[PDB]
Amino acid sequence: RPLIGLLFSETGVTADIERSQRYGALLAVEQLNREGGVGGRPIETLSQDPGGDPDRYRLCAEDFIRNRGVRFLVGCYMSHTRKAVMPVVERADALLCYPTPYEGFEYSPNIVYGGPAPNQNSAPLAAYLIRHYGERVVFIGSDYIYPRESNHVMRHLYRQHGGTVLEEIYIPLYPSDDDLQRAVERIYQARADVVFSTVVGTGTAELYRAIARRYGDGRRPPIASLTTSEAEVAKMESDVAEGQVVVAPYFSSIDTPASRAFVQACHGFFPENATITAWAEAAYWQTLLLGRAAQAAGNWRVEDVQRHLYDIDIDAPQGPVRVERQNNHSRLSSRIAEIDARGVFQVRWQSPEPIRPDPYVVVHNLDDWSASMG
């Protein structure tokens, strides 16, 4: 049975981006079913809502693999939700596509990483920030492993290039009102040139609004984020969102027919409460790759499908992508964008070509990015 299990929250702290991933994956299934399904048989999907809880992700993965015969999964966002599912898929010899940016330092034979490792997003973003913004920075992130690992690198990068990391603040994943106010007051008391955010999900919008109001509605330090997506920026007033900085392989404003085709496809298929994001883009291309690899194999056997996966370079909405057989990570484009006054993402820099993944690199050499940014 060509059945893809979709493990994306519907509820919880990251519900917006993960609903976005779910529809991107569903969009692909639909397109694959118009291309002949898998050997005449239509591709089916099964969805469960783990609600951002790592233990519920594990339980949903276990239900799918144990009781539904699922061997192909698309899902997970926050890194600890990936860690909770990983062992289940590896013991069942299943294949999980993770269309999410992450901290790196992982190799799983059963995981196809469709989102960037730090050499593909944080590094270029660090080079950019040190290049254009003042060197006194203040960090604010949600309290879980990804923002913490992401801050661990950024802290070291700024100190190496003559910067000062004034405050490094963490707030809980569903941050109370007091949490935000205390955090914003510290940000306001540090007088930073830039705010580097790693806050993820619900509370992102409120955070950016509180920074906004707090400041004397005047030439605040800009917010540069590794995590904020289009789903968070749509919840922001025009003036709050304006001038904020964001990084991703894809932005709905990209100027290509491939990007245009994806926007249109998403607009006529996604619900009202599901914004297009870079992670919907990644769920789409990965789910699409799965289907074509299966079509080329003629079956739905992980071993057969998987073999055909490393050989199919796809034409994704972001540009051309492929999965490297050596590390299960992908060759991804990387864009840095500044939000204009009408809430639109203006790409300010792009890597000249897709960046090859190197999840374990410890020393990020920022000189790599001198030519293309200055």
């Binding site: 860690k83 062992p87 901290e103 790196g104 330092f105 992982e106 309290d143 492993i145 913490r148 690992e149 661990h152 690198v153 410890v362």
Partner: protein, 194 residues
């Protein structure tokens, strides 16, 4: 010895410093199958109230980090430390380096990982602790000879005595007082000095 290390396992007092749950249960039950005396412990205490030979701990980034790092730094010099690791990322591996673990178990753990890491980590912590101790014994000896040397020179000047006299006095004073010869020097001394 290999046989004395293997034969002593059942007398080790093991602590599982980790929140109660499946990981903790399995870990405690395997240690009980190996035959060690074992206990689990959560939230991290300020000090252990009972002797501990080996600690198994998880690696936290929140407030439990500073609690565990402070508690473990307080422990006895032959306390074996094993970390339960869930990530291979820089901030997490740096903390394992900073805690000075003697072994690691990558998660999810299963029964088979336990004994080989325990024995292994235990020969490592035994060797390291003896090496450290020797370093400390040498440091102590260096400082102590320096202090005795400066108290003798202090006595020479004060009294017009040569070295033999100075040395004779210190020994006689130390010998008949039931206090090390270094105690006399320190009680004499107090140059607010070296």
């Amino acid at each position: 010895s290999a046989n004395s290390l293997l034969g002593s396992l059942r007398e080790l007092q093991v602590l599982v410093l980790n929140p109660p749950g499946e990981v903790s249960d399995a870990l405690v039950l395997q240690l009980i199958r190996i035959g060690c005396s074992v206990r689990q412990c959560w939230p991290p205490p300020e000090a252990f109230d009972v002797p501990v030979d080996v600690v198994f701990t998880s690696i936290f980034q929140n407030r439990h980090h500073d609690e565990i790092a402070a508690l473990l730094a307080a422990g006895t010099p032959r306390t074996t430390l094993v970390a339960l690791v869930e990530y291979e990322s820089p901030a997490v591996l740096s903390q394992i380096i900073e805690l000075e673990c003697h072994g690691v178990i990558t998660q999810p753990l299963d029964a088979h990982r336990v004994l080989p890491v325990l024995v292994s980590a235990r020969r490592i912590s035994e060797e390291m602790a003896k090496l450290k101790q020797k370093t400390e014994q040498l440091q102590d000896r260096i400082a102590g000879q320096a202090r005795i040397n400066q108290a003798k020179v202090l006595l020479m000047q004060r009294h017009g005595w040569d070295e033999r006299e100075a040395h004779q006095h210190l020994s006689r004073e130390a010998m008949k007082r039931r206090e090390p010869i270094l105690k006399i020097a320190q009680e004499l001394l107090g140059n607010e000095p070296s």
